[PDB]
Structures are given as structure tokens and as C-alpha cells.
Design an enzyme around this catalytic site. Structure first.
Site, PDB file in Angstrom:
ATOM      1  N   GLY B  10     -17.660 -45.934   3.597  1.00 40.59           N
ATOM      2  CA  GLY B  10     -16.545 -45.339   2.888  1.00 40.59           C
ATOM      3  C   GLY B  10     -16.272 -46.019   1.561  1.00 40.59           C
ATOM      4  O   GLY B  10     -16.926 -46.986   1.168  1.00 40.59           O
ATOM      5  N   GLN B  11     -15.263 -45.500   0.854  1.00 38.68           N
ATOM      6  CA  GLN B  11     -14.982 -46.008  -0.484  1.00 38.68           C
ATOM      7  C   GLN B  11     -14.671 -47.499  -0.455  1.00 38.68           C
ATOM      8  O   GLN B  11     -15.304 -48.291  -1.164  1.00 38.68           O
ATOM      9  CB  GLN B  11     -13.816 -45.255  -1.121  1.00 38.68           C
ATOM     10  CG  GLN B  11     -13.551 -45.726  -2.550  1.00 38.68           C
ATOM     11  CD  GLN B  11     -12.430 -44.975  -3.237  1.00 38.68           C
ATOM     12  OE1 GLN B  11     -12.522 -43.771  -3.462  1.00 38.68           O
ATOM     13  NE2 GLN B  11     -11.365 -45.689  -3.582  1.00 38.68           N
ATOM     14  N   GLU B  71     -19.188 -38.680   0.739  1.00 42.15           N
ATOM     15  CA  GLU B  71     -19.299 -38.063  -0.574  1.00 42.15           C
ATOM     16  C   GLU B  71     -19.972 -39.053  -1.510  1.00 42.15           C
ATOM     17  O   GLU B  71     -20.060 -40.247  -1.202  1.00 42.15           O
ATOM     18  CB  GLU B  71     -17.933 -37.616  -1.124  1.00 42.15           C
ATOM     19  CG  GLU B  71     -16.877 -38.688  -1.345  1.00 42.15           C
ATOM     20  CD  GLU B  71     -16.791 -39.182  -2.779  1.00 42.15           C
ATOM     21  OE1 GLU B  71     -17.277 -38.488  -3.701  1.00 42.15           O
ATOM     22  OE2 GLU B  71     -16.180 -40.246  -2.993  1.00 42.15           O
ATOM     23  N   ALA B  99     -14.537 -37.021   4.398  1.00 36.05           N
ATOM     24  CA  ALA B  99     -13.783 -36.792   5.620  1.00 36.05           C
ATOM     25  C   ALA B  99     -12.348 -36.364   5.357  1.00 36.05           C
ATOM     26  O   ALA B  99     -11.593 -36.161   6.317  1.00 36.05           O
ATOM     27  CB  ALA B  99     -13.797 -38.058   6.484  1.00 36.05           C
ATOM     28  N   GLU B 254     -20.265 -70.508  15.806  1.00 38.41           N
ATOM     29  CA  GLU B 254     -19.621 -71.611  16.506  1.00 38.41           C
ATOM     30  C   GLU B 254     -18.108 -71.566  16.335  1.00 38.41           C
ATOM     31  O   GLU B 254     -17.363 -71.880  17.273  1.00 38.41           O
ATOM     32  CB  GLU B 254     -20.205 -72.929  16.003  1.00 38.41           C
ATOM     33  CG  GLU B 254     -19.973 -74.104  16.916  1.00 38.41           C
ATOM     34  CD  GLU B 254     -20.615 -75.360  16.376  1.00 38.41           C
ATOM     35  OE1 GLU B 254     -21.842 -75.340  16.133  1.00 38.41           O
ATOM     36  OE2 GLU B 254     -19.893 -76.357  16.174  1.00 38.41           O
TER      37      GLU B 254
HETATM   38  N1  LIG Z   1      -9.140 -53.325  -0.762  1.00 36.83           N
HETATM   39  C1  LIG Z   1      -9.540 -52.098  -1.082  1.00 36.83           C
HETATM   40  N2  LIG Z   1      -8.998 -51.010  -0.430  1.00 36.83           N
HETATM   41  C2  LIG Z   1      -9.396 -49.754  -0.746  1.00 36.83           C
HETATM   42  C3  LIG Z   1     -10.351 -49.548  -1.727  1.00 36.83           C
HETATM   43  N3  LIG Z   1     -10.550 -48.215  -1.833  1.00 36.83           N
HETATM   44  C4  LIG Z   1      -9.750 -47.579  -0.946  1.00 36.83           C
HETATM   45  N4  LIG Z   1      -9.014 -48.520  -0.282  1.00 36.83           N
HETATM   46  C5  LIG Z   1      -8.026 -48.288   0.784  1.00 36.83           C
HETATM   47  O1  LIG Z   1      -8.663 -47.451   1.753  1.00 36.83           O
HETATM   48  C6  LIG Z   1      -7.797 -46.431   2.239  1.00 36.83           C
HETATM   49  C7  LIG Z   1      -8.359 -45.040   1.966  1.00 36.83           C
HETATM   50  O2  LIG Z   1      -9.582 -44.847   2.641  1.00 36.83           O
HETATM   51  P1  LIG Z   1     -10.975 -44.753   1.838  1.00 36.83           P
HETATM   52  O3  LIG Z   1     -11.904 -45.876   2.232  1.00 36.83           O
HETATM   53  O4  LIG Z   1     -10.716 -44.771   0.349  1.00 36.83           O
HETATM   54  O5  LIG Z   1     -11.573 -43.315   2.253  1.00 36.83           O
HETATM   55  P2  LIG Z   1     -13.085 -43.169   2.792  1.00 36.83           P
HETATM   56  O6  LIG Z   1     -13.506 -44.398   3.561  1.00 36.83           O
HETATM   57  O7  LIG Z   1     -14.017 -42.908   1.635  1.00 36.83           O
HETATM   58  O8  LIG Z   1     -13.065 -41.888   3.767  1.00 36.83           O
HETATM   59  P3  LIG Z   1     -12.750 -40.420   3.184  1.00 36.83           P
HETATM   60  O9  LIG Z   1     -11.374 -39.979   3.623  1.00 36.83           O
HETATM   61  O10 LIG Z   1     -13.773 -39.442   3.708  1.00 36.83           O
HETATM   62  O11 LIG Z   1     -12.810 -40.475   1.676  1.00 36.83           O
HETATM   63  C8  LIG Z   1      -6.446 -46.633   1.553  1.00 36.83           C
HETATM   64  O12 LIG Z   1      -5.514 -47.162   2.469  1.00 36.83           O
HETATM   65  C9  LIG Z   1      -6.720 -47.587   0.393  1.00 36.83           C
HETATM   66  O13 LIG Z   1      -5.647 -48.478   0.223  1.00 36.83           O
HETATM   67  C10 LIG Z   1     -10.905 -50.638  -2.391  1.00 36.83           C
HETATM   68  O14 LIG Z   1     -11.753 -50.468  -3.265  1.00 36.83           O
HETATM   69  N5  LIG Z   1     -10.493 -51.914  -2.064  1.00 36.83           N
HETATM   70 MG   LIG Z   2     -14.003 -41.358   0.392  1.00 36.48          MG
END
Ligand SMILES: Nc1nc2c(ncn2[C@@H]2O[C@H](COP(=O)(O)OP(=O)(O)OP(=O)(O)O)[C@@H](O)[C@H]2O)c(=O)[nH]1
Ligand SMILES: [Mg+2]
Ligand SMILES: Nc1nc2c(ncn2[C@@H]2O[C@H](COP(=O)(O)OP(=O)(O)OP(=O)(O)O)[C@@H](O)[C@H]2O)c(=O)[nH]1
Ligand SMILES: [Ca+2]
Ligand SMILES: [Ca+2]
Ligand SMILES: [Mg+2]
EC number: 3.6.5.-
Lengths: 422, 440, 61
Positions: B10-11, B71, B99, B254
Site C-alpha cells: 500500500g501507499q 494502484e 481498495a 534475541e
Molecule cells: N507514516 C505514513 N503514513 C501514511 C503514508 N501514506 C498514507 N499513510 C496513512 O495510511 C492511511 C491510509 O492508507 P493508505 O496506505 O494510504 O492506503 P493504501 O494502503 O494504498 O490502500 P488503498 O485504500 O487501496 O489506497 C492513513 O491513515 C494515512 O495516515 C505515508 O507515506 N507515511
Molecule cells: Mg492506495
């Protein structure tokens, strides 16, 4: 990328539709010939959401122009950017509709729908990954309301897992005297509640009141109303059209805005109506800046999207959005935590250094539906003008059922207004 | 051997992966093209950095990593960016439709379309390991991919790799950077579903990191870039024992023995110091005693909670840089007389210490000062259950009205999965309560 | 050691089976929700036919 297919049906739908394409074509640096002459790559990063890239580096709206009235095609090609639309995507009747929903939905509209679907399919099948559809149209006329809702149901039969978004213009006696418009509106709402995922309630009552009372326009023209509409649609699609973190596609917006499937009728707002961040924020939450004739302080927010545009401090925006929620705590339902989400896009709309766009899913929207229901029932009370509809084959209860579904909608909005956390 | 494979989902998982791998490259002197002039064994080796990097015959040092997102726009930036030569294109896997912040879509509707391909690519990384130790899975709780796809992947990895170890870096949602109202739902669903399939999970509360960037670094409104650079430093401290060797080095496994007293009690609290700006690090050398005392200041924790109101089951200190045991022991003895450190009665109280001598690195143009010594504390405290409590409460508010549940049902899920996930969380919260009660 | 092998295997097995059951019931559930939506839309199409037919017959007046 994530393509949206745009449909404009009828006079209102086509007319605000052209203004929408004019406004965003300008923001994205596309001129009436389809050529890009803009200054920022950020204008093109997501251009393909609304445009097809034809060779010669010509960009073409992914839009389909529809009406049972053939005159509006010409006026579309006449207006600025009429050259840009795809000639095949003009789908015209000849006989018009005459403000008769039944004619748009069941008879003359149903004769023409297949030809529209052929254009929809063609556009859809050329999409890398279609996300869904947006329809511009009025609910008071006969084609946009009746054929527009017919097209929604037929498109859904065949893209049942794609998002269906509408920009629905609600009738108001202040703008149009046509007496059957409450029938047409109520028949349309009976369809939208079942078959769209998210509807922007563009209320002519409110557009009139803004133009007269705030903009001080004694006799508002459809161009005055539509200037507010074009600014709103530009605003509520900023997150779809530019690189962004929040509500970046139609499904994620729906997931953030729609806690219950029927309650997807949104109250848009805009600021400034014609500046500091505290003033933008305060204005965009004010009843006077809503494009739906509803007082939010007469109900409660299930969800809200706020989009700020321009050069500004994200620190200040965050402080002010927190400030308004804390000082207006009672008007946000406590059982949906963190229900207000904020986006900040760096590119302001044209003519402004700074702007704010509001999207509210408020239980106060029942005020709109109650107004339509009052006008509906006054005429149905005495079965006035029903012959126009039973003449096309309709049964007298379809009116009863649409009336009943809409009042059910109002009462569901009231139920969640009255709900508490504990 | 003892290879570790990293999976970024994911992102948030991908962008945190960008930051960790850039930082690892700098710590090991690996160039953006993968070349490492200091490595004299071409095409292979048994060095410590080979736990995380494979080697090609042309001298390229390649992350043992898979990036996956439903994506393509985030991984596209990896493919075209500064470290794009570092990754074989098969290591970077994308679909076309995400998603939509919906666990159901990440785990079922969309994720099932790409899971076999992902597993195939992980397998190709595993087949070139001579002694695979386990996996490091980076993901958000809140996204639909980070929650749903990660859960699906962890279930499938249990099947394909048995009880081979799986550690998580999980991003706990914060309203300041949150992107969706339903993040509490996705957080509880994935926590329930992965709980049996994870041996150890490091929660990173975005609000904790957000606050640290604001208070300690004078970042007015932190971005994901600010947060991720700080996150990568904590991650780097945790994995340093795997990528470097040294007499006083202590392996992460450990520490794990001490950190996990029961399979479900496997969520350590991380506290990191020093987080200081260059402006304020100038002429201020922070002693071992200073960075160690900072570990018991709750404002430096990766998860917001108050260990002073809970009980300790383990305390680990992971030092890097100019640090020797004498100074550590003196600092610890001071802290023990000053601080609110109460252990449950069934555990020994000694702190467990590792020291890696390679000092911390910083990415150029960053916010953190370069310092001579840093420390990450891993503690197992009952107080981390507060993070579950806050998130379970938000879940309860929405679920009592079934707000947004229709988006999950429409993708095939049942209300029973929501209630079952929530009941597991309630049991987890009592588990943390029960382990803190004195023995009889 | 036989008990260790048996418990790792049983764990692998039950995990494989639980996921299979869940993937199947999600597929069935999602399909039934889509099928219900399409059936409702289809019932709209008959009602529209019945309205056009009802007009054929008021024109026989
Ligand atoms: N620390 C940190 N948190 C992130 C980042 N990008 C998104 N988030 C957090 O991740 C959550 C959103 O989920 P995402 O990971 O962006 O979405 P995804 O995993 O791509 O899944 P999809 O819904 O399909 O897009 C939010 O609560 C954001 O605060 C990042 O680059 N760094
Ligand atoms: Mg995403
Ligand atoms: N805001 C706005 N409303 C409009 C505009 N044009 C028409 N309307 C409204 O739309 C309603 C009537 O619907 P129309 O779109 O004009 O008619 P139609 O959809 O083409 O249907 P038929 O005329 O029967 O073929 C009236 O209540 C008008 O107030 C417009 O340009 N802007
Ligand atoms: Ca308010
Ligand atoms: Ca080597
Ligand atoms: Mg007309």
C-alpha cells in the site's frame, strides 16, 4: 488512468455541462482546439480522468451530449469550446419532451436511450480502468430528469460495480413557473435514491437567493446561476483532477461521504461568493454560501469534505477546521468520529487567489426534500395535470410510491439526526 | 544467510519503504545504481548487509524486497525516481484499481486478483536465500490495501512458509493525516485477521510521529516525507542488529525472546532519541545518559500511551554509535532510581542491551541532526493497549449504527466478521489487563 | 519432534482451509448482492414495457 465518463442530458444538463468543460479546460490548459498550452505539468498529471488523448496531442472531453430537443446540440457547438467535443458523441432526438417526465423516462427517451448507450459503451471500453459516470441534468424538466434517470438505470445494468455520480439541479418557482416541476422532481428523486451513489443537490432556490441577496443581482440570468454552478463543479472535482491524497477518485469519496446507501444527497457550498483562511472557513460553513436551500444549523453533519484552493498555510487551515468543529460540536454527529476531511490544492480557480469548496452530507437536506414534497402534494392532492403522465401509460400509484419513497428518505435523515452515541 | 525479505504494502508501506531503503543504502555506502565500492566480493557474500541486499554478478546490490500496491501511482514514482536502478522491475507490483479505503476490496474483491502473482515474486526472492529468517511487512492499518491485502498476504504466507517468522511495521491512523472515516474498521479487521500470523508487530502511531516532528523538529505542518524520514530511522535502529555485526551487537531475534511472553502479546513499544534539529544539535553533544533518559519520556514514543500507568514485561535498549557498556549501565542505574518503571511480578527487571558501533546516518536535505549516538528502546508495556482502546472505541461508535458497513457487505463481507474481529480485540484488551495482574 | 511437525502442519492446514471457506463465502455473497441489484433493475425494464403497452391501449380509444 481512472477515467470518468461524463453525460449531459437536456437543456439544463447540457448548459451547465458546457460551462463545466469550459472551466476545467481552462484550469488544465486546454484550448477550444484540444491543444495543451499550459504552464504546469501538474495540469496534465491526471488530465486523462476527463479527457481522451487523441493523436496530434489533441485532448478530447470524455463527454456525451444528449437531448430529445435537437436545438441544444447547435447551441453547444455554438458556444466556446463547442469545437472540442466529439461529433459522434452528440445524440439528439427531434420531438423534445415538453416537461413531461413520463415522456423522457418511458416513451421518447426510451426510444433514444439505446443510441446513447452505444456511445457510452464506446467511451467506456476504451478506458484503461473506468471509475464511473457523472451526469449533469435538471429534475424539473422532462429529458434531463426523466431520460437522465432512465440512462442511469440502463448504465447501472451494465456497469453495476462502477460509481454513478450526478449533478442534479432542483427546481424552484423563483426561477421557473412550470407547474409540473414538483412531479418531475419527485419522480426523479425516487430514482436517484435507488440508483446513484452520490448526488450533488444543485438547488435553483439557493442559486437564486445567492444571486439576488448576496451578489445583489436584481434579475438573475441562467448565466448568473450557472456561474455559481460552474465554480461549484470545478471545486468538487478538484480532488479528482489534480494530484491529491484525499477523495482522489469517486469511490473513495463515496466511502468517506455515504454512511448509509440512501443518504447520498450532498449540500455543496463555495467561498468566496463575489481574503484570510479564517474567513474562507467561516464563510464556507455559513448557510448563505450553500448551493442547497438548507440551514445546516437545522440538522447535523454525517460527513463533510472541504477543499481549499490557493497559496496558503496548511497550518492555518488545520487550526481553523479544528476550530469550527469544536465551536460547532453539536452539528456534527458524535457517532461518526473524525467525519470532516480537508484537502488543499495549490492551484486556485481562475480569477481568485484563494477559494474553498464545501461538500456536506447533512440531515438538514430534508428541508429541500420537504419543500419539493409540499409542492408535489398540493397538486397531487387534487390530481392536477396527471393526464399528461397517465397519457404515456403511467399508473397513478407510481406517483404514490415516489411520494412515499421520498418521505421515507426525509424520515431516515431525521432518524440519524436524532441518534445519539450513548 | 539469515536473509530477511521486506514486503511493502500500500501507499504508506511503499513510501516508508522508499525511505528505509534510501537510508540503508547510505548506511552501507550503496549507490543509487546499486554499486558498493567497498564490497570486494563480487556477485555474492555472507556479510551482514547481505541479510537485506542480494548481489548480482555485475556488482549490483539489490534490496531483498517486494513493493505491492493495488494502484500504480505510488510505485510508479519508485520506478522513475532516484533509486529506480536499485530494483528489478518484478520487485515492483501494481494493479490498476485500489481498495478504496475498504478492507473487503483489499482482502477479497481486488486483492484476490494479484495475490498469486505477489506470492510468486516473493517466492523468487526466497529461492535465492540460503537461510531465510523471515519477512518484514510494512503497511498502514487504515488503507484498504494496507489492511485487507496485508491480511490476505499474511494468511497465505503462513501456509506457504509455515511458522517462519513474520514481523510487521504497522502505521496506526491519526486524524491529522487520515484519509478515510472508516480507518477504525480497517484497523480492527486487519488486526484480528493477522494476529495469529504475526510473531511481532511494531506499531507506529502517525500522531506520535506528527507531534515529534512538530515539537522536536519545528516542522510547522509535517508531511508524509517528514514522518517517513523519522520512521525510517526507528526502523533502521531496529534492523541495524541484522545488517551490521559487532562484538556488542545483539540480534533482533534475541530481543524478541524477551519481548513476546505470550504469542498474542507481541506489540512492542518503540521510543527513539535523540530527535533534534541541526539548529539545536550545534554545540550540544547529547550523552548516553541524556538519550537514554529521553527513552522514558512519553513524548518520544512511537505510540501515544502512558507506560507510567502500566506495567513492564520487558525493556530493551538498542544503541548505535559512540556508546560503551559502562556509560549505559550508569545511565540505567540513574533512571531506575528516578523513573516510574514497574515490572509485572512474573518478569525479571534487567534491561537487555545491544550496541552497534556504526553511528546514525541522515538523508541529505533532511530535518534530523546528524548525531554521534542514538538509541531505540523496545519495551513490552501493558500501556500499549491504550492504542487498542482508542481505536476500538471509534469502531464501536460507528458500528452501533452500522455506519458505512454497507460498503463492506456490498463487497461480500458479513456483519459476523465485524463482530468477531471486535470480540478478538476485546479479548486482546483483557489479555493485556490479565498479564498485568499480580500472581497469587 | 513429531508433535512439533504435526502442530506446524495442522496450523498450515487450518489456515489454508479457513481462507478457502472465507474466499468462497465472499464470492457467493458479493455475487448474490450483484445479482439482486441486476434483478431489481430488470424488474424496472418490465415495468417500463408495461407502461409503453398501457399506452398502446389508450391510443385504441
Ligand atoms: N507514516 C505514513 N503514513 C501514511 C503514508 N501514506 C498514507 N499513510 C496513512 O495510511 C492511511 C491510509 O492508507 P493508505 O496506505 O494510504 O492506503 P493504501 O494502503 O494504498 O490502500 P488503498 O485504500 O487501496 O489506497 C492513513 O491513515 C494515512 O495516515 C505515508 O507515506 N507515511
Ligand atoms: Mg492506495
Ligand atoms: N441552474 C440552471 N437551471 C436551469 C437551466 N436551464 C433550465 N434550468 C431549470 O431546469 C428546469 C427545466 O428543465 P430543462 O433542463 O430546462 O428541460 P429538459 O431537461 O431539457 O427537459 P425538456 O425541456 O422537457 O425537454 C427548470 O426548473 C429550470 O429552472 C440552467 O441553465 N441553469
Ligand atoms: Ca456549523
Ligand atoms: Ca560481497
Ligand atoms: Mg428542453
Amino acid at each position: 488512468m481512472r477515467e470518468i465518463v461524463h453525460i449531459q442530458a437536456g437543456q439544463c444538463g447540457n448548459q451547465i455541462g458546457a460551462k463545466f468543460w469550459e472551466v476545467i479546460s481552462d484550469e488544465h490548459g486546454i484550448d477550444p482546439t484540444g491543444s495543451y498550452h499550459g504552464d504546469s505539468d501538474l495540469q496534465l498529471e491526471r488530465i486523462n480522468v476527463y479527457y481522451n488523448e487523441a493523436a496530434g496531442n489533441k485532448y478530447v472531453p470524455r463527454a456525451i451530449l444528449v437531448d430529445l430537443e435537437p436545438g441544444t446540440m447547435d447551441s453547444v457547438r455554438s458556444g466556446p469550446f463547442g469545437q472540442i467535443f466529439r461529433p459522434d458523441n452528440f445524440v439528439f432526438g427531434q420531438s423534445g419532451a415538453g416537461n413531461n417526465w413520463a415522456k423522457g423516462h418511458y416513451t421518447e427517451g426510451a426510444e433514444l436511450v439505446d443510441s446513447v448507450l452505444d456511445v457510452v459503451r464506446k467511451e467506456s471500453e476504451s478506458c484503461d480502468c473506468l471509475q464511473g459516470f457523472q451526469l449533469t441534468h435538471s429534475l424539473g424538466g422532462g429529458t434531463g430528469s426523466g431520460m437522465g434517470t432512465l440512462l442511469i438505470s440502463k448504465i447501472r445494468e451494465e456497469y453495476p460495480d462502477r460509481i454513478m455520480n450526478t449533478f442534479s439541479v432542483v427546481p424552484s418557482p423563483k426561477v421557473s413557473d412550470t407547474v409540473v416541476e414538483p412531479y418531475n422532481a419527485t419522480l426523479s428523486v425516487h430514482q436517484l435514491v435507488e440508483n446513484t451513489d452520490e448526488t450533488y443537490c444543485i438547488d435553483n432556490e439557493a442559486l437564486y437567493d445567492i444571486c439576488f441577496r448576496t451578489l445583489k443581482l436584481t434579475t438573475p440570468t441562467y448565466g448568473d446561476l450557472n456561474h455559481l454552478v460552474s465554480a461549484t463543479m470545478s471545486g468538487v472535482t478538484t480532488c479528482l483532477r489534480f494530484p491529491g491524497q484525499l477523495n482522489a477518485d469517486l469511490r473513495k469519496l463515496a466511502v468517506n461521504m455515504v454512511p448509509f446507501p440512501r443518504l447520498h444527497f450532498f449540500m455543496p457550498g463555495f467561498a468566496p461568493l463575489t481574503l484570510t483562511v479564517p474567513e474562507l472557513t467561516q464563510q464556507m460553513f455559513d448557510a448563505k454560501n450553500m448551493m442547497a436551500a438548507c440551514d445546516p444549523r437545522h440538522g447535523r453533519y454525517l460527513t463533510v469534505a472541504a477543499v481549499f484552493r490557493g497559496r496558503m498555510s496548511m497550518k492555518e487551515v488545520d487550526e481553523q477546521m479544528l476550530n469550527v468543529q469544536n465551536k460547532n460540536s453539536s452539528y456534527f454527529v458524535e457517532w461518526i468520529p473524525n467525519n470532516v476531511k480537508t484537502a488543499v490544492c495549490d492551484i486556485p480557480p481562475r480569477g481568485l487567489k484563494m477559494s474553498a469548496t464545501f461538500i456536506g452530507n447533512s440531515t438538514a437536506i430534508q428541508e429541500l426534500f420537504k419543500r419539493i414534497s409540499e409542492q408535489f402534494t398540493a397538486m397531487f392532492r387534487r390530481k392536477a395535470f396527471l393526464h399528461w403522465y397517465t397519457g404515456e401509460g403511467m399508473d397513478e400509484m407510481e406517483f404514490t410510491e415516489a411520494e412515499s419513497n421520498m418521505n421515507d428518505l426525509v424520515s431516515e435523515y431525521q432518524q440519524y439526526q436524532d441518534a445519539t452515541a450513548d | 544467510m539469515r536473509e530477511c525479505i521486506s514486503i511493502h504494502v500500500g501507499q504508506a508501506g511503499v513510501q516508508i519503504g522508499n525511505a528505509c531503503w534510501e537510508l540503508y543504502c547510505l548506511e552501507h555506502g550503496i549507490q543509487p545504481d546499486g554499486q558498493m565500492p567497498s564490497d570486494k566480493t563480487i556477485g555474492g557474500g555472507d556479510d551482514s548487509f547481505n541479510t537485506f541486499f542480494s548481489e548480482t554478478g555485475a556488482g549490483k546490490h539489490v534490496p531483498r524486497a517486494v513493493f505491492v500496491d493495488l494502484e500504480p501511482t505510488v510505485i510508479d514514482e519508485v520506478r522513475t525516481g532516484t533509486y529506480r536502478q536499485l530494483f528489478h522491475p518484478e520487485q515492483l507490483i501494481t494493479g490498476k484499481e485500489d481498495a478504496a479505503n475498504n478492507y473487503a476490496r483489499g482482502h477479497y474483491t481486488i486483492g484476490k486478483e494479484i495475490i498469486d502473482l505477489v506470492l510468486d515474486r516473493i517466492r523468487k526472492l526466497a529461492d535465492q536465500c540460503t537461510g531465510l529468517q523471515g519477512f518484514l511487512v510494512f503497511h498502514s492499518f487504515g488503507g484498504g490495501t494496507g489492511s485487507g491485502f496485508t491480511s490476505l498476504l499474511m494468511e497465505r504466507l503462513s501456509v506457504d512458509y509455515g511458522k517462519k517468522s513474520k514481523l510487521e511495521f504497522s502505521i496506526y491512523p491519526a486524524p491529522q493525516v487520515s484519509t478515510a472515516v472508516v480507518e477504525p474498521y480497517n484497523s480492527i479487521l486487519t488486526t484480528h485477521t493477522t494476529l495469529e500470523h504475526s510473531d511481532c508487530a511494531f506499531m507506529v502511531d502517525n500522531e506520535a510521529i506528527y507531534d515529534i516532528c512538530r515539537r522536536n523538529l519545528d516542522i510547522e505542518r509535517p508531511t508524509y516525507t517528514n514522518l517517513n524520514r523519522l520512521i525510517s530511522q526507528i526502523v533502521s535502529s531496529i534492523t541495524a542488529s541484522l545488517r551490521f555485526d559487532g562484538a556488542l551487537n545483539v540480534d533482533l531475534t534475541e530481543f524478541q525472546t524477551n519481548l513476546v511472553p505470550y504469542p498474542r502479546i507481541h506489540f512492542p513499544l518503540a521510543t527513539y532519541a535523540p530527535v533534534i534539529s541541526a539548529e539545536k544539535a550545534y554545540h550540544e553533544q547529547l550523552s548516553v545518559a541524556e538519550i537514554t533518559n529521553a527513552c522514558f519520556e512519553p513524548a518520544n514514543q512511537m505510540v501515544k500511551c502512558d507506560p507510567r500507568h502500566g506495567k513492564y514485561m520487558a525493556c530493551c535498549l538498542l544503541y548505535r554509535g559512540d556508546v560503551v557498556p559502562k556509560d549505559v549501565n550508569a545511565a540505567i542505574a540513574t533512571i531506575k532510581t528516578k523513573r516510574s518503571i514497574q515490572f509485572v511480578d512474573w518478569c525479571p527487571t534487567g534491561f537487555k542491551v545491544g550496541i552497534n558501533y556504526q553511528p546514525p546516518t541522515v538523508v541529505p536535505g533532511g530535518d534530523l541532526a546528524k548525531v554521534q549516538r542514538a538509541v531505540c528502546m523496545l519495551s513490552n508495556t501493558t500501556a500499549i493497549a491504550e492504542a487498542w482502546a482508542r481505536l476500538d472505541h471509534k469502531f464501536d461508535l460507528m458500528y452501533a449504527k452500522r455506519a458505512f458497513v454497507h460498503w463492506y457487505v456490498g463487497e461480500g463481507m458479513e456483519e459476523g466478521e465485524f463482530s468477531e474481529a471486535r470480540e478478538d480485540m476485546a479479548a486482546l484488551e483483557k489479555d493485556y489487563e490479565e498479564v498485568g495482574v499480580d500472581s497469587v | 519432534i513429531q508433535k512439533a511437525i504435526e502442530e506446524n502442519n495442522n496450523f498450515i492446514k487450518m489456515a489454508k482451509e479457513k481462507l478457502a471457506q472465507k474466499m468462497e463465502s465472499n464470492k457467493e455473497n458479493r455475487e448474490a448482492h450483484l445479482a439482486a441489484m441486476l434483478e431489481r433493475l430488470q424488474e424496472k425494464d418490465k415495468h417500463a414495457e408495461e407502461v409503453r403497452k398501457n399506452k398502446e391501449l389508450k391510443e385504441e380509444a
